[PDB]
Design an enzyme around this catalytic site. Structure first.
Site, short mmCIF file in Angstrom:
data_model
loop_
_atom_site.label_atom_id
_atom_site.label_comp_id
_atom_site.label_asym_id
_atom_site.label_seq_id
_atom_site.Cartn_x
_atom_site.Cartn_y
_atom_site.Cartn_z
N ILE A 122 3.09 3.81 -17.29
CA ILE A 122 3.11 4.05 -18.69
C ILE A 122 2.18 3.55 -19.56
CG2 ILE A 122 5.31 4.79 -20.00
CD1 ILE A 122 6.80 2.20 -19.01
N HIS A 167 -0.72 -5.68 -16.44
CA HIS A 167 -0.27 -4.66 -17.00
C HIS A 167 1.25 -4.90 -17.46
CE1 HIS A 167 1.87 -0.47 -17.80
NE2 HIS A 167 0.59 -0.33 -18.38
FE LIG Z 1 0.89 0.92 -20.29
#
Ligand SMILES: [Fe+3]
Length: 833
Positions: free
Chosen positions: A833, A684
């Site tokens: 996020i 990620h």
């Molecule tokens: Fe993300």
């Protein structure tokens, strides 16, 4: 033994809230003889086969510890116990206040003949009336199931039932019920039957599950969930932030809900010109911003999280930072070395693969689509510097594709049927003898107007440095970035990390007790994932959200994730498996991680492998502390129910796939755990923290293509010849979508000042009792310090050009640590996020 000193630490609601309090507000302060009550549960002495619970005790204190923390209050209680109560290893608590408080910990000191006991809570306690059963919190003792206290087995069992909560009902803010449901809440079918999207989940469209929210169905569709002003996630999976600047998901709700309206009005009412003219207009974005007049602004106001979030000083503004890939060589983005470097060391660094055979086949059926074979063949693949044959270059592990062909074709008619004009690409790369890659050709496939069955209408392109053909190469490259940016956003990013981690967060909380070895292993790798996915489901991957309107596959984007997911294999996410499947490496046990990389200066896979084994060693050490045998890992009922529901419900659309680890084995547990943490942490980070540094210039990373290619002495072609900047600008992402793109991916690239990176970082020094794992996690954290030092070394080696480029951008992405802000570095534990 009279009184055991309990002392509770907490944070009040107004301190982890974006608005609440002034100075003197919702600060909730003077606590006494009831406001909060605690009962102690016994680990040692019972009533039936259930530990003694002992007398509601008020919190008779309120002052300093004195190192409590920033904005943390601490209370005090003197619990009258004896010995025949036994040792407490759990407690029930009750909030009598209006407001909820964030309970951090409770330390049980001065207990006779025994040591000071730690409770690590990090959970909110709402008012006592919201709960059937009062909040139970166990002590920091890790326990496998057949290792629980016999007074505590029933409270542990009981607590996992209440987190599981039956599969009925509309879920509330204060709830902690982990349950699953399909993606059926993305569309708004009631406010038009054109915003109706399909379900992602089941027979028809395979997909992971999302957290169940239980809202009412729609008027027009009984099988789709109505929108909500509040999207529910299990309360403790939504983290507050002590600082306003760190509510980035809130600043992304506030783009989608607040900033976008203003822009729509400014363009529509022409306060802003609809399209860029030169490339110097685009660079000014980052030099002076999006401006708007006082009078327009003083009326259409306020949106203050776009505060010193975008640091829009004075007025007549909105503001972007100069992206890194343009910081030092402004035009580096045009160069084919930066174009191909970014395949290996960019924003989306893991799609590329080896060429095994030539011509290059289509894996789609001919009776329905045709001969979708590659028409990049032999002639144009033998250039200026390229002494080999195509047959010697594949032989030598030197020829590579970026196939954006076949997943695209069924959806392309449909993509192109309105304001977006585009191709389904294919791109061949040559690993030059200097360690760098280069493009040798691009076949652009267009749909074919006499049907899908006589298609495609392909056109090959090759490097150019001459007149107008220079710009045709550029536009050919942008039709490939366009194809890739949306494969990124959606597959490399939303599906492969965000969407597939959700069932893990849900399956761990429902079947693995908060006191379990493996719950606590995985746990910090889930931080804010359920919160950013609930707001993604509401403001980013919804019918008309930022992803459909800013990126190429549009309305069909998420429907396409489901079909690409028909091919998602969990095993292959593990970075060795990945590299070995794409063919950019081979299992060479003589070689450092057990894999030899065929593109040897591949910065993502090189630093990646360093971080992969750093994760995998720790989870193997950890797991060993708790399972001395495969036959006792089998003997664990919670763990076997964790993996059973995970693979069967969580990712149940692939539940009969052959690659699933069956958790009969300690090494099965170790790779399952390490793959997961890899996805949550490093993968990620690799595909996300380099979104505004690389794609923060639409020139470098275009998201939509509006026109097709200029052909041969066309008015388009001569207009491009006349001024090529403007026609290029007319082909890519136009201004409005450039601006919404940029505002999202900037916030998305930021590290909150309260972020938790890999290593050193979990919640508390006493998160476990066990001294072995605590010291085995400081060594893993030291190991990353060391590995960062080896990575910092490779960015001073000016031999490895692939980790710098025309862009002069040292591939800082897999550096495991970072400062806040929009650094091009840092690996959080989780998808935050
Ligand atoms: Fe993300």
């Amino acid at each position: 033994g009279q009184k055991i000193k309990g002392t509770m630490v907490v944070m009040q609601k107004n301190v982890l809230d974006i608005n609440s309090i002034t100075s003197v507000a919702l600060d909730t302060v003077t606590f006494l003889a009831s406001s909060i009550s605690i009962q102690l549960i016994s680990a040692t002495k019972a009533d039936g086969g259930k530990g003694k619970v002992g007398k509601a005790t008020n919190l008779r204190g309120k002052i300093t510890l004195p190192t409590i923390g920033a904005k943390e209050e601490a209370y005090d209680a003197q619990f009258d116990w004896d010995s025949d109560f036994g040792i407490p290893g759990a407690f029930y608590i009750k909030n009598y206040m209006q407001n909820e408080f964030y309970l951090k910990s409770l330390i049980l000191e001065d207990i006779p003949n025994h040591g000071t006991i730690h409770f690590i809570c990090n959970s909110w306690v709402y008012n006592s009336k919201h709960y059937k059963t009062d909040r139970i919190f166990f002590a920091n003792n890790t326990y496998l199931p057949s290792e629980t206290p016999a007074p505590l087995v029933k409270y542990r069992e009981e607590e996992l039932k209440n987190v599981r909560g039956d599969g009925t009902g509309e879920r509330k803010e204060w709830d902690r019920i982990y349950d699953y449901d399909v993606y059926n809440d993305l569309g708004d079918p009631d406010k038009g039957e054109k915003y109706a999207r399909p379900v992602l989940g089941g027979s028809a469209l395979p997909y992971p599950r999302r957290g169940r929210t239980g809202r009412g169905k729609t008027r027009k569709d009984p099988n789709s969930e109505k929108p909500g002003d509040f999207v529910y996630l299990p309360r403790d999976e939504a983290f507050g932030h002590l600082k306003s600047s760190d509510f980035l998901a809130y600043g992304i709700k506030s783009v989608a809900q607040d900033v976008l309206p203003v822009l729509t009005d400014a363009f529509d009412g022409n306060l802003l010109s609809l399209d860029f003219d030169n490339f110097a207009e685009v660079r000014k974005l980052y030099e002076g911003g999006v401006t708007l007049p006082t009078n327009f602004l003083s009326n259409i106001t306020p949106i203050p999280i776009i505060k010193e979030l975008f640091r829009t000083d004075g007025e007549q503004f909105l503001k972007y930072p100069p992206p890194k890939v343009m910081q030092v060589d402004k035009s580096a983005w045009m160069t084919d070395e930066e174009f191909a470097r970014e395949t290996i060391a960019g924003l989306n660094p893991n799609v590329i693969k080896i060429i095994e055979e030539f011509p290059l086949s289509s894996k789609l059926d001919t009776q329905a689509y045709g001969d979708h074979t590659c028409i990049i063949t032999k002639e144009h693949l033998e250039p200026n510097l390229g002494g080999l044959t195509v047959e010697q270059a594949i032989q030598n592990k030197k020829l590579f594709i970026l196939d954006h062909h076949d997943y695209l074709i069924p959806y392309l008619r449909k993509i192109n049927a309105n304001t977006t004009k585009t191709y389904a690409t294919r791109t061949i790369f040559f690993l030059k003898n200097d360690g760098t890659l280069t493009p040798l050709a691009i076949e652009l496939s267009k749909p074919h107007p006499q049907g899908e069955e006589y298609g495609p209408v392909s056109e090959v392109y090759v490097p150019s440095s001459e007149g107008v053909e220079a710009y045709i190469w550029l536009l050919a490259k942008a039709y490939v970035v366009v194809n890739d940016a949306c494969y990124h956003q959606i597959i490399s990013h939303w599906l492969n990390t965000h969407a597939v981690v959700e069932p893990f967060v849900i399956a761990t909380n429902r079947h693995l007790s908060v006191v379990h070895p493996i719950y606590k292993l995985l746990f910090p790798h889930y931080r804010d994932t359920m919160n950013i996915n609930s707001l993604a489901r509401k403001s980013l991957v919804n019918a008309d959200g930022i992803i459909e309107k800013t990126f190429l596959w549009g309305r069909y984007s998420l429907e396409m994730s489901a079909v690409i997911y028909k091919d998602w294999v969990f095993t292959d996410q593990a970075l060795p498996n990945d590299l070995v499947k794409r063919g950019v490496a081979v299992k060479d046990p003589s070689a450092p991680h057990g894999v030899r990389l065929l593109i040897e200066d591949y910065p993502y896979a090189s630093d990646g492998l360093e971080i992969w084994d750093a994760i995998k060693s720790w989870v193997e050490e950890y797991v060993s502390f708790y399972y001395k045998s495969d036959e006792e890992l089998q003997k664990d009922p919670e763990l076997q129910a964790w993996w059973k529901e995970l693979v069967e419900v969580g990712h149940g659309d692939l539940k009969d796939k052959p690659w699933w680890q069956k958790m009969q084995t300690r090494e099965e547990l170790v790779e399952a755990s390490a793959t997961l943490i890899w996805i949550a942490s490093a993968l990620h980070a690799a595909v996300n923290f380099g979104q505004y540094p690389y794609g923060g210039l639409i020139l470098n990373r275009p998201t939509i293509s509006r026109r097709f290619m200029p052909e041969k002495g066309s008015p388009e072609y001569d207009a491009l010849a006349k001024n090529p900047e403007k026609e290029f600008l007319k082909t890519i992402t136009g201004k409005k979508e450039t601006l919404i793109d940029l505002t999202i991916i900037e916030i998305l690239s930021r590290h909150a000042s309260d972020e938790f990176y890999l290593g050193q970082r979990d919640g508390g020094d006493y998160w476990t009792s066990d001294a072995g794992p605590l010291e085995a996690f400081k060594r893993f954290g030291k190991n990353l310090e060391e590995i960062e030092k080896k990575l910092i070394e490779k960015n001073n080696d000016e031999t490895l050009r692939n980790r710098y480029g025309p862009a002069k951008m040292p591939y800082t992405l897999l550096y495991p640590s970072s400062e806040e802000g929009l650094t091009f570095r840092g690996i959080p534990n989780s998808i935050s996020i």
